[PDB]
Amino acid sequence: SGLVKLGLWGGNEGTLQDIDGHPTRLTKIVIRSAHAIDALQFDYVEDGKTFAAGQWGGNGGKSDTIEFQPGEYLIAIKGTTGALGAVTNLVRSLTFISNMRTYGPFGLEHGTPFSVPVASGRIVAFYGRFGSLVDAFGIYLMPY
Amino acid sequence: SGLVKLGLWGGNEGTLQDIDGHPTRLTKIVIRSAHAIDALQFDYVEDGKTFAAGQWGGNGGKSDTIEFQPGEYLIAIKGTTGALGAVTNLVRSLTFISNMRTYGPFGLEHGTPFSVPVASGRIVAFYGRFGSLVDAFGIYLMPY
Amino acid sequence: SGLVKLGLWGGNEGTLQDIDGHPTRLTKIVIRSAHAIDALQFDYVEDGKTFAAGQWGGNGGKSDTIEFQPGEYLIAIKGTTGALGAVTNLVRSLTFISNMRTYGPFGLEHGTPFSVPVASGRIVAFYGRFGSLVDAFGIYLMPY
Amino acid sequence: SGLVKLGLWGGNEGTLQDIDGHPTRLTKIVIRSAHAIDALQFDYVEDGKTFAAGQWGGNGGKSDTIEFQPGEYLIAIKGTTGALGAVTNLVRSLTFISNMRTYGPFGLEHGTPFSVPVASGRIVAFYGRFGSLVDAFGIYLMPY
Ligand SMILES: OC[C@H]1O[C@H](O)[C@@H](O)[C@@H](O)[C@@H]1O
Ligand SMILES: OC[C@H]1O[C@H](O)[C@@H](O)[C@@H](O)[C@@H]1O
Ligand SMILES: OC[C@H]1O[C@H](O)[C@@H](O)[C@@H](O)[C@@H]1O
Ligand SMILES: OC[C@H]1O[C@H](O)[C@@H](O)[C@@H](O)[C@@H]1O
Ligand SMILES: OC[C@H]1O[C@H](O)[C@@H](O)[C@@H](O)[C@@H]1O
Ligand SMILES: OC[C@H]1O[C@H](O)[C@@H](O)[C@@H](O)[C@@H]1O
Ligand SMILES: OC[C@H]1O[C@H](O)[C@@H](O)[C@@H](O)[C@@H]1O
Ligand SMILES: OC[C@H]1O[C@H](O)[C@@H](O)[C@@H](O)[C@@H]1O
């Protein structure tokens, strides 16, 4: 693997979903959100071929697409976790900050904050726990 | 060099302090704290030799020592940042969770939280910004 | 920076040439050769952008181009070192073996052999020593 | 794992033997040898605890022990593979070069040479194929 794997942020419900590969570049994120984060889908590169992970989560909210340009990469992720309805603890919001611009916040910023500023490294993939929504979230990082 | 470097959590004052080496094992932390985190000092192993980083920060508060046992390693770090006195934003508290027990809280766990749960990897060193207190804090992780 | 760097195979003359980047994928090699290896040039990907390293070496011999397909990567490299003309020790031949086919031999496979079979990892870049020919050769590998 | 794994050098007989761990430091090698390399055993450090790998191979030849000092690490390995008796291809000799001294050659230098000079990295463990002798040999390297 040889990735640093951070997580999980969020609760214990839903079902664990994870990659089966060796990503070296994150190229695309499709995120569904509204009052919380509904679903995650992302594309990564491995040995020059592009693979799609997800979609993980439900079909609620509205969709937003992040297509990273060549030379663009994530330098930080922020979010919040907390209650919604009957769910004790899930991912309420996510913000993706690249070296060129900020994407988000997606969802609504309620609950306990978290933040992952990256001084040296590359974010290449994600994992989490998912049901009809994103119960929990985690990150794969590669040394730079 | 092949480490993922996360940070900084906290403010922009004090002075940057950082390691000059290639750590593969964190063996000891000495932390001074009271209402905030006053100072950090830690030992790491490189090529079988033990090196001391720090002390970074002042001589206020009280001292606590964490000596990791063989087979003991950090699985998560928590903290809070915020104002103290005349300082706009510094590290108010830190908690270190190993696979055997929890160390802390050091400081006071009020203010804005951050958290770094490690699903796969090893925390091997730290860096930050320091004056008479710990202005900012960061972490080095190795893939596992 | 988080790469394993193997080398050098060959002699001590010519001039050191090396990359200035963080490669994650080798996409192309252009090699000039005849009785020895005359020059090396290769393309790699970093943050989704393609960068060209080299050409290192002279304009003798004949050119061959290796363009790796998506999903194609090197699993082994072979070569030989030895004398040519007035040069005490240089790279006489190189063979590049991918998971799909074998490229070469380039040069002449006489002299002292070396071999780098990769059980787990990825070859992402090269370096060496160069004058009018390839005096010496080395390899960058990434954990897989 | 997050190690670069090189190999195998040697033949296809014997039985594959390999580590079940995440070594970060090689501390000791015990090698049995005579006309070829008979067996390998080595100690490594993981999360500050010492683990013994092997012994792999038979009980022939004579034993030699390499105990690395703090601050001592391997910078290169050399060897030869080839026939002995009824064995078509096995490991005939090995030499271990540290930043302080050279250990070996062990065995007898017959057959096809190989060499692994390390410009950047650390050798932390080995694997191979083994019967009554060392049929084949491989190396684990960590980025530095
Ligand atoms: O964000 C959670 C939830 O928010 C809103 O109620 C709707 O858009 C749903 O489709 C969505 O699942
Ligand atoms: O995603 C929110 C919610 O989705 C579904 O209802 C179930 O899988 C729950 O376990 C989960 O908490
Ligand atoms: O921790 C910051 C600061 O907190 C309080 O003001 C006192 O207890 C000091 O000893 C300490 O330096
Ligand atoms: O550490 C708290 C404080 O210490 C010193 O007074 C200076 O370095 C300041 O810049 C810093 O904010
Ligand atoms: O390859 C080294 C050298 O080999 C021969 O001398 C010739 O074919 C040259 O074209 C070439 O430069
Ligand atoms: O490359 C072969 C030869 O090329 C040039 O003449 C010089 O750089 C030499 O040092 C080198 O040995
Ligand atoms: O080295 C292979 C072989 O060499 C010699 O014949 C003896 O020392 C044996 O014990 C050993 O197995
Ligand atoms: O190690 C040399 C030899 O040992 C044993 O005889 C068997 O396991 C063989 O397969 C192997 O080739």
Residue numbers in the entry:
A (entry chain A), B (entry chain B), C (entry chain B), D (entry chain A): 2 to 145
Source paper text:
Size-exclusion chromatography clearly showed that AcmJRL is a homodimeric lectin in solution. AcmJRL adopt the expected β-prism fold with the three characteristic Greek key four-stranded β-sheets (β1–2 + β11–12, β3–6 and β7–10) and all the connecting loops well defined in the electron density.
Two structures of AcmJRL in complex with D-mannose (AcmJRL:Man) and methyl-α-D-mannopyranoside (AcmJRL:MeαMan) were obtained at 2.75 Å and 1.9 Å respectively. In both cases, the asymmetric unit contains two molecules. In site 1, D-mannose oxygens are within hydrogen binding distance of the two carboxyl oxygens of Asp136 (O4 and O6), the hydroxyl of Ser133 (O5), and the backbone nitrogen of Gly15 (O3), Ser133 (O5) and Leu134 (O6). In site 2, the binding mode is similar to site 1, and the D-mannose oxygens interact similarly with the two carboxyl oxygens of Asp39 (O4 and O6) and the backbone nitrogen of Gly62 (O3), His36 (O5) and Ala37 (O6). In the AcmJRL:Man and AcmJRL:MeαMan complexes, the distance between the oxygen O4 of the ligand and Cβ of Glu14 is only 3.4 Å. This represents an unfavorable contact that could be responsible for the slightly lower affinity of AcmJRL for D-mannose and mannose-containing oligosaccharides. In the complex structures of AcmJRL, the distance between the O1 oxygens of the two binding sites is about 14 Å, making it impossible for mannopentaose to be bound in both site in the conformations observed in the AcmJRL:Man complex structures.
